[PDB]
Amino acid sequence: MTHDLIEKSKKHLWLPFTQMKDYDENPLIIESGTGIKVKDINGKEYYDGFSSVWLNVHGHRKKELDDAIKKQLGKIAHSTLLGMTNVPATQLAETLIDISPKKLTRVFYSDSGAEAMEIALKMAFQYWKNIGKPEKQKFIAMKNGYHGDTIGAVSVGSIELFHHVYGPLMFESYKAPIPYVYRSESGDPDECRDQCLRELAQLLEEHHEEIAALSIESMVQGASGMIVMPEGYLAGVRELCTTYDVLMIVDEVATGFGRTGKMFACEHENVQPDLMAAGKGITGGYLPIAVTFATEDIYKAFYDDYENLKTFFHGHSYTGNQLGCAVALENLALFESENIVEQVAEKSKKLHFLLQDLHALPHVGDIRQLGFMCGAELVRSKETKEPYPADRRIGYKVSLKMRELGMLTRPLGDVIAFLPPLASTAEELSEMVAIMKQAIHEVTSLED
């Protein structure tokens, strides 16, 4: 009836980033969403406290967004961008160029964030080959960094739950140290920033001639536990990259489009990427579209007569999908007409105090926040900062507790993520912090 839908799900599906024995024990099937809440096939409603995995902006069944896709259906759903283009993709490219960092003048589409990162890495590799510098073939990427699941993006990721096993498949990369101030040693953001930059510079001084690009998440590392970079760090990596002739790839797939209370997160420190990835909330969270921005200097390294062999030979079949681009176009009009970014910045002030209060809980160790990008790191001892053994599944148990309490999210290890939709109201925010607090306590007061 809907009983059968549940059994079908367990019989035919294989779900991303999930142990299916876990799914089969606690299955959940979503049927509709309205505002910032989704509804399962039984009629239970849940706050979407993780924005459907960090991509949902205006909430669900956002009226203008729905209208924008109906309008485009009435014209054409998809025609190709291989050797040509279409209207919404071209319009969107100009709108994207207008709001991104000033040095990024080019828009290369694809389907997902891993793909946009996969394209940034290939662009950066082929640039140096193109301009007669074929030795520049290694990458630097940051520890605790994550850039997607395909093999290039994996070669540049460093979350060892996900990646360690795939080492034989990975290309040659250096891993640079980032600040993780919470379980640091001095606990000072300036000291941690300066030490990690010092070590970046020494790595660069020794090997830059072999290195095409450096990859880094913009301001906040997400899959690693919503670890926010100390002030001045990102701008410090930009300078080091410029100085040692390494292209800087900035990953904005999670932080992009208002998430950190700027349109793009590298605005906090005014950094200009050479290459920049984006996805998730670009479409409001409706459809798979992704982008790699490039500078003009990069673009023209590939512009030449065709048998001069400059061409970038990459491109997915759905590249520039009109349906995706149309809803992205409306999304960005909503940012403008709603003043979304400003409202996120305002609402994050009070949210700040709401989140700092969780510290009152015995097993909450750290609270991290930049805008609407937050994590509560759970700890078996605040004093110690010693974490619970992984085998007690504390983050997992907390997610399940929140779920029965009517709120959806996913933990990053024992870090409880909180990335509520950008349209979230001040009262919705406090209603979600309250459920999260209740859940952490109920689970954690028993150290399950």
Next chain:
Amino acid sequence: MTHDLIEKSKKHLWLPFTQMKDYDENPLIIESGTGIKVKDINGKEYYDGFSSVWLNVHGHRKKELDDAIKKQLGKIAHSTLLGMTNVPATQLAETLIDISPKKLTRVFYSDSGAEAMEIALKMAFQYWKNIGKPEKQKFIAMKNGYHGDTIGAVSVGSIELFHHVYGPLMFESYKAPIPYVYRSESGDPDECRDQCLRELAQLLEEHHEEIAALSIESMVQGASGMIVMPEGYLAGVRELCTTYDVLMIVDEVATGFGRTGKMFACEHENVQPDLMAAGKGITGGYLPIAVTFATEDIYKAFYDDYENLKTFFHGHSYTGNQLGCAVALENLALFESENIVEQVAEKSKKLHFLLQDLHALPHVGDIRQLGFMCGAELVRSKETKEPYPADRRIGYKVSLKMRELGMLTRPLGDVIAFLPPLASTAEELSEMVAIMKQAIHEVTSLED
């Protein structure tokens, strides 16, 4: 204004698989489509003779497909498949399992064909270490194989012009030869087949204890020039993969969903893949949805208590998108109520005769076809079968002539690809083949 949308496209876009200097010289912006024709912003109409790069099934503005997406907007556009599922992804999963090879019982969603292949390759690699055979970690891919553009897909793909700037970023891979009947000495499909299988068997015999999987396009190598595998070749590959304990990965991204006159091309030789990649036409050409099918034996090697770390740690954020899944569900209902596959198979009989007439031209060296998947290889000499030098751009020029004559396709080197929508009538196919024949004559008669 037409002229400034055109100048915006030259200014802010970087297109897929395109030398932007070629684009600038000959810009083309599509506005709408109706049935199997698309229309540019100047109002000029074109036959869609490459199905918008091999993905459009029913034409454009297909009413049923249109209704299906509108109906889904009215419920929800995207909620996550991480740790949970939704209604259309669940229903779609069931239907896909029913129409796919019987041994394939499991569906793992993604956004694109490359991502589906990347998933297949990561499943094969981790499968063997989950069951305690870490030795089995190498891949075999077929000479002239194309599996997508992301780094893992290109590590198992061999299109010299595409891959191998990127040599340094692969991942070593065993390359086996495919029978290329047209420019082979005997040729003779049976002689070719059996010798390429003798070389595979040799490769397996020596290295099979190191090999995780063999990766192969299903029945036709597309990007390499629409090269049809001889009868018995695919069934022999499968047999040798079984004999030597190597998983068979089958790429159906281009051939899948009716293209070759079967629902899946592997049905031609009755082959059961271990892992099967699909995409493109899965949605009728409307949206980016892809699938990796897996057997239950493979699924169950990642199925275990979370602490025994069996889990597949992979999954894009738009996995199981309701919008793509909804349109795909309706796409498949059409295959059923419109008997698309049987209609393609039937129409393909007369079509073969249209294409044999094409063969009458002095510079048409070969015609290749399986269902609606066709290729007309151009040669400067049809008795020596010598190719035009690349530097005289014969494929590119033919595609531009077809353009002005009102038809879109893309060449593969000097092979003119012909992949018309599956809804194409008998009349429309002959209209299309005639425009293609005129354009080959007008370009090629001037080139000696």
